[PDB]
Amino acid sequence: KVFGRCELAAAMKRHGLDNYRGYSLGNWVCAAKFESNFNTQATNRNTDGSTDYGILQINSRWWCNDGRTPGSRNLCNIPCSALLSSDITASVNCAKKIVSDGNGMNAWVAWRNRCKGTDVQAWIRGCR
């Protein structure tokens, strides 16, 4: 599923991501835009052999199990394919753990390079 911008904002808010760990809703929408372009099915392989899954590009070395990643820890206790669902619940629950791990939203490289320090409120402008 490719979410609309305000559609994803409403879903992230209903799931408790707005202001979670101090990160306003626009930070999360901006992160999803640049990690997956709002596409729940997005997958991308990394040079270390891991793969990133879903709307928030959650990694198979630390967070989810994909069965093909050396040194996998599966800290979210979830198959990586579950993070590709049209229902974002599993991605939100895992992202809440990632953002609590010590580095905040710096865990998302696209957030650090394309959202951090910008006017993130623009990503929720116009939404009701």
Q: What is the resolution of this structure in A?
A: 1.5
Q: What is the span of the domain harbouring residue 39?
A: 1-128
Q: Rounded distance, CA 45 to CA 61, Å? A: 11
Q: Rounded distance, CA 20 to CA 127, Å? A: 19
Domain count, the chain: 1
Instruction: Enumerate the known binding-site residues for substrate.
Output: 101
| Residue 87 falls in the annotated catalytic set | no
Token pair, residue 9, equals 């904002």
**Which residue in 50, 47, 13, 49 sits closest to 32, CA to CA?**
13
Please give the C-alpha separations between residue 70 and each of 18, 48, 54, 82, 119, in angstroms, as whole numbers. Answer: 34, 9, 20, 20, 38
Find the catalytic residue in 52, 66, 87, 119. Answer: 52
Q: Rounded distance, CA 67 to CA 50, Å? A: 10
CATH number at residue 57: 1.10.530.10
| Residue 7 falls in the annotated catalytic set | no
Give the determination technique: X-ray
